Every structure is written in structure tokens, then in C-alpha cells.
Amino acid sequence: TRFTDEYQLFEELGKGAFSVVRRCMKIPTGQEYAAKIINTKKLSARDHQKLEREARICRLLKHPNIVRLHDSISEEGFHYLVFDLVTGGELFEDIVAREYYSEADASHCIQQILESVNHCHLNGIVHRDLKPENLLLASKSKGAAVKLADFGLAIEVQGDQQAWFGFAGTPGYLSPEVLRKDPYGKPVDMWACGVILYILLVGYPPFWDEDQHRLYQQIKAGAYDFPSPEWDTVTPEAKDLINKMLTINPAKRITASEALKHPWICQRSTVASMMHRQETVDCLKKFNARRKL
Numbered sequence: 001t002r003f004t005d006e007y008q009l010f011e012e013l014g015k016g017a018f019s020v021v022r023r024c025m026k027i028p029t030g031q032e033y034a035a036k037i038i039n040t041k042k043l044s045a046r047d048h049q050k051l052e053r054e055a056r057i058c059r060l061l062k063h064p065n066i067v068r069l070h071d072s073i074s075e076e077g078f079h080y081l082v083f084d085l086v087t088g089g090e091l092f093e094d095i096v097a098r099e100y101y102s103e104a105d106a107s108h109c110i111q112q113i114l115e116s117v118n119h120c121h122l123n124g125i126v127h128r129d130l131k132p133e134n135l136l137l138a139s140k141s142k143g144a145a146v147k148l149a150d151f152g153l154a155i156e157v158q159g160d161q162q163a164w165f166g167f168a169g170t171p172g173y174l175s176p177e178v179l180r181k182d183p184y185g186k187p188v189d190m191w192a193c194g195v196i197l198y199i200l201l202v203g204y205p206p207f208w209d210e211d212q213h214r215l216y217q218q219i220k221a222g223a224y225d226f227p228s229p230e231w232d233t234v235t236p237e238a239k240d241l242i243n244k245m246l247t248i249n250p251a252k253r254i255t256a257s258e259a260l261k262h263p264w265i266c267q268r269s270t271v272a273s274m275m276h277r278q279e280t281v282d283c284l285k286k287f288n289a290r291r292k293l
Ligand SMILES: CN(C)CCNC(=O)c1cccc(-c2cnc3ccc(-c4cccs4)nn23)c1
Pocket: 013, 014, 015, 021, 034, 036, 067, 083, 084, 085, 086, 087, 089, 133, 134, 136, 149, 150, 151
């Protein structure tokens, strides 16, 4: 009964089909947290496994770019995962509020995302649902680091053991191997990082169709473009990283630590363009609006 007795519940930060996240304060310290609240009534043994796996994954991952777990509390009927509170909102909503936004800032963001995908992979965790809603920002007052969130769909892998761990993911970000029902692993997070990198540069997604089945065929072919004019001002090194992240052969796809050594990431001041990209800001506003529905 540790949560009800020591915490005060506040407003809802987000809601889904099977959980809710609410802000909360610890009554003794006055420190503020985010509580993920899961109904544990009448779960199967399969669901109990998934929920204790989520709590295990969140306890293990300690990294400046991953939401930090403060306590996992089991009350009768409910489970609470209590994370340190990050107040900076979604990454993509902070970007559209910037008056200066360049490839160097995109590279900065993707470098933090990559550090976190890397830390997951070193601990043998595949996130499987990288997407803008899962990319929070720490307060500008605390450094504005990017925070990877929500490991509810994550899996634990041993070494490079690859298998068909079932369908999971969000359609625009799904890798070709998942869509083929082929065995997959860590590379599915690098594919998603390439879709996010792409959107971070131009404000719209690399694969898109109003017909989801045609969307899937485009993904499986790996058929994205760098159309003029917007891509004409983008450096070739940034286009090269996308190319290595969006390869349909998962064995040849670049890995997270290899991508942290790409010159566009680790030689940012000399390689990434520093011009403001106002057309990306505008497209991203339309991107963010559509995803809100
Ligand atoms: C879309 N998913 C992210 C899940 C639903 N949550 C939201 O939409 C949301 C929106 C705005 C802010 C927050 C927020 C603020 N501080 C924290 C700390 C930790 C976490 C999470 C850990 C595991 C899952 S959320 N969320 N969190 C969540």
C-alpha cells in the first residue's frame, strides 16, 4: 500500500488502452514524479509476465537519456511505476517552437536518442516502439536532455539471439523485417531512428500512404527519397547516415554505437549544416497536428 499512503495523485499526463500516467508528489519529500498506473486485476499469467518484465527493464536502465525509475509499487488491483518527472514536454513540440533549428540541432537530438538506444542494446533490451510520443525532454532548466520513455513493449534479448518476437510497433516506424514476419532484433530500433532522423530534417515521414497496405509495401521496398528542393540544402553526410539506418537488410544496417561514430554525429561543428531550416519547422507543425488526430 506504499503508493496511496505516500503519494498525492494529480492530473493525467497521458492515457492509453491499458494504462494511465499521472503526475504525482511524494508527501514526505515534496518531490514530484510521474506515475504509470496499470490495472492488475484478472490478468493472465502471460500479462503478469509482461508487467514484471516492464518493471525489470525500467529498474535496470539507468542513463541520462532514459526516464529514471524511482519505485515500482504493487498494490492490490494496481501496479505503479514511479519515474522521475520530466517537465520539458515532447521533443517534436519543442522543435516547432524554436526560432533557430538546424542540422546541428537535429544531430544533437539524434545523438542523445542514439546514446539511449545504445544503452538499451548494451543491456540487451529492444524497445520496439521508438516514436515521437516516446521522446520527452528534460526541463531547459536542467539541461534539456532527451528522455526515452515507455518500455511497455520492450523485450529482453540475449546477445544477438534473433527471433520472431511477435508484431509490435507503430505503422510508420515499422522495420521491413517485422512486416515480413521475419526474425528480428536490435536493428528494428535503428530503423525507427532513421525514420525519426528523416522527419527531424524535413518535417514529414520517409514512408507515407493514406492506404496502410501501400504504406507497408513502400516500407518493405525501402523506397524513400530525398526530393528537391528541401533536401538540396541538406548535407550529404546527413543523407548518408539515413541511408545506413534505412537499409532493408538488417544485418547490414548500422548499429547504435557505430552511428555514434558517424562524422555527422561526432564531428557536428564541422560536418552538420548550421542554416536554419524554416520549412522543416512548418512541415513538422503539420506533422504534429496530424498525429494528434
Ligand atoms: C506516451 N508515453 C510516453 C506514455 C504515456 N505518457 C505520456 O504521454 C506523457 C506525456 C507527457 C509527459 C509524460 C511524462 C513526464 N515525465 C515522465 C516520466 C516518465 C514517463 C513515462 C515512463 C513510462 C511511460 S511514460 N512519462 N513522463 C508522459
